[PDB]
Design a protein around this nucleic acid. Sequence first.
RNA 1: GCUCUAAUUGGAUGGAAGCAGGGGCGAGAGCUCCUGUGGACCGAUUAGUGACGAAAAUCCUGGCCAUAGUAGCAGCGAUAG
Length: 50
Amino acid sequence: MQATIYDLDGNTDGEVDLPDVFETPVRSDLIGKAVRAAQANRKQDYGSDE
RNA sequence: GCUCUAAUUGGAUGGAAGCAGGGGCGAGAGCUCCUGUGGACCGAUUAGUGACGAAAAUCCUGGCCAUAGUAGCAGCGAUAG
Ligand SMILES: [Mg+2]
Ligand SMILES: [Mg+2]
Ligand SMILES: [Mg+2]
Ligand SMILES: [Mg+2]
Ligand SMILES: [Mg+2]
Ligand SMILES: [Mg+2]
């Protein structure tokens, strides 16, 4: 498909090919999984005094 | 059903949470409304998180009732007024 390029006045100026990846089938399961992982990976270790 | 995180999305000084008493729903775990009190915070859905649910362990700590206006405040070679 084609994407409409805009200038700083908000007026259409030219257009470009929308790249193929924007046709990637949308997987909300895979997306949820990647997000859960990034969210987990910044959590800090903790525990009570041994 | 409980905690806290995230996204999405709501409620509150025109009165949140909690608590007391009461009305409705669910087989039920439990949900929800009304009144009073309270006087500042509280949810829902989804995906997570876990120090997550008690009637019991001679269980732990604290508080409290009965026991009870009961035992003792006599006994001793110093009977003390
Ligand atoms: Mg050890
Ligand atoms: Mg939502
Ligand atoms: Mg049992
Ligand atoms: Mg005790
Ligand atoms: Mg007696
Ligand atoms: Mg005498």
